[PDB]
Amino acid sequence: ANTPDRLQQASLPLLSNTNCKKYWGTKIKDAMICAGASGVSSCMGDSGGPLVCKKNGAWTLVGIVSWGSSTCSTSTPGVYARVTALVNWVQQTLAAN
Amino acid sequence: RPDFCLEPPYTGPCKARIIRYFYNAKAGLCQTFVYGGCRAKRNNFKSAEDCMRTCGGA
Amino acid sequence: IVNGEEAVPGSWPWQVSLQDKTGFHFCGGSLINENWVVTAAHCGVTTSDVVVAGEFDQGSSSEKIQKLKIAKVFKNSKYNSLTINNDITLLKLSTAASFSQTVSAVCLPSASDDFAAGTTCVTTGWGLTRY
Amino acid sequence: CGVPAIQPVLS
């Protein structure tokens, strides 16, 4: 009931909202993207961390660890904030402060 | 003694790791627990005192 | 993370740990530049929490870890307490991170970008390893 | 951005 000492990593795939919705149904929203059910699961203490994807050889922020199964089940999809949807907002703020 | 004070601590679907206080009807006092960050229940306070005033000896 | 492997020290240089004044870690975060961290809305960061960059082993004291402060916490106005949507929050660093080879920055996608389903991405963090 | 100094592994 204690978090890891050394930082951790796990490799998981992205899902299609469609396919993610096979599990979460309507709880899935526009600014949400899913990844997981592959045998690894984000869990308590991981929120606000990153789901990065290799774009053009560069790791890109694709989502922020948000929510999911209440027992960090590794068979269900993990739901992350969808950065492509919030990126506009990110920029208006950076660009204003 | 609102009946929510009887409810067991609720972590939630979110994945953060926040310390909150709930009311433990069995021991008659507020304890701490890890709330996930969203969709809280009412037996979940930000301080033990609030928790004591609200569910105190419920 | 559950069923993940332990990382190669310093390989995900954007990853920060958000912690309270007493040192307790409650959420991860990621660096997008010398001055800004993108973390989740519901993490509920404040200007009293501290951003900690450079760490890997939170047990080891002997590490070149930068321990920065929060100037402004920008919670996304559209975030939803109940639906958990638009769960994002920027943090303006009171004091910029010194980008080292363990304190780099991640790339923001373009609003225009489209990451195909099946793409193998990676997630990191110091969260429970078992529920 | 996105290019770390120490390469990550098994990723």
Side-chain angles (χ1 to χ4, degrees):
Chain A
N2 208 347
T3 60
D5 243 343
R6 305 172 192 277
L7 180 72
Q8 308 293 300
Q9 60 164 71
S11 282
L12 68 197
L14 296 185
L15 317 200
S16 46
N17 268 22
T18 293
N19 190 101
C20 189
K21 280 177 179 148
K22 283 194 176 187
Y23 188 89
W24 292 116
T26 53
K27 299 314 189 191
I28 299 305
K29 304 316 196 191
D30 56 352
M32 298 185 174
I33 177 168
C34 311
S38 58
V40 290
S41 159
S42 314
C43 192
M44 264 107 298
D46 289 307
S47 293
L51 177 85
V52 287
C53 300
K54 230 144 74 180
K55 201 249 293 189
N56 279 343
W59 290 102
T60 306
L61 195 48
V62 172
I64 291 143
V65 172
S66 183
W67 59 278
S69 130
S70 280
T71 69
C72 318
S73 165
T74 54
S75 314
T76 84
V79 186
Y80 306 81
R82 167 178 297 224
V83 200
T84 53
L86 303 324
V87 60
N88 256 116
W89 181 78
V90 166
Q91 260 116 35
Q92 325 244 351
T93 312
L94 287 192
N97 305 286
Chain B
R1 39 78 185 133
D3 272 29
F4 67 62
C5 299
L6 300 181
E7 291 290 279
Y10 187 66
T11 282
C14 278
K15 317 254 144 278
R17 184 153 167 268
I18 305 178
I19 297 162
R20 288 297 174 91
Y21 295 74
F22 74 96
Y23 178 79
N24 200 333
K26 309 158 193 175
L29 42 57
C30 292
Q31 282 175 8
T32 54
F33 81 103
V34 158
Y35 159 60
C38 66
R39 306 203 92 261
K41 288 207 179 327
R42 291 128 97 206
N43 205 357
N44 171 324
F45 304 79
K46 288 171 243 291
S47 80
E49 179 186 38
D50 281 353
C51 181
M52 281 314 275
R53 305 176 159 306
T54 301
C55 296
Chain C
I1 308 178
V2 177
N3 260 42
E5 320 130 30
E6 168 196 321
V8 156
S11 64
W12 307 110
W14 44 77
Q15 165 85 72
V16 290
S17 138
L18 287 154
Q19 326 176 150
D20 75 4
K21 43 165 88 83
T22 81
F24 189 85
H25 168 99
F26 64 91
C27 282
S30 123
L31 281 169
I32 55 171
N33 82 15
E34 307 79 79
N35 293 275
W36 298 82
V37 181
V38 192
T39 193
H42 79 278
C43 271
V45 178
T46 74
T47 72
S48 319
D49 295 325
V50 165
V51 174
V52 177
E55 221 169 28
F56 156 82
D57 195 291
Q58 299 202 152
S60 283
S61 172
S62 210
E63 289 206 309
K64 297 181 180 180
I65 78 184
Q66 316 185 36
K67 186 247 222 181
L68 327 163
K69 284 182 182 183
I70 294 141
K72 269 167 185 174
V73 173
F74 297 84
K75 187 178 169 182
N76 174 3
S77 32
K78 288 149 81 283
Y79 164 57
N80 194 324
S81 324
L82 301 177
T83 42
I84 319 169
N85 194 51
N86 308 302
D87 187 10
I88 187 159
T89 281
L90 293 192
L91 288 171
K92 185 167 154 199
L93 290 176
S94 176
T95 45
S98 292
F99 290 3
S100 74
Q101 70 159 35
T102 55
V103 178
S104 194
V106 72
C107 286
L108 287 170
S110 62
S112 327
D113 276 313
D114 177 73
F115 308 88
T119 306
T120 313
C121 301
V122 183
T123 179
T124 58
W126 286 278
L128 295 193
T129 13
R130 194 183 180 177
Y131 186 48
Chain D
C1 59
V3 163
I6 297 80
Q7 275 284 288
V9 308
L10 191 41
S11 310

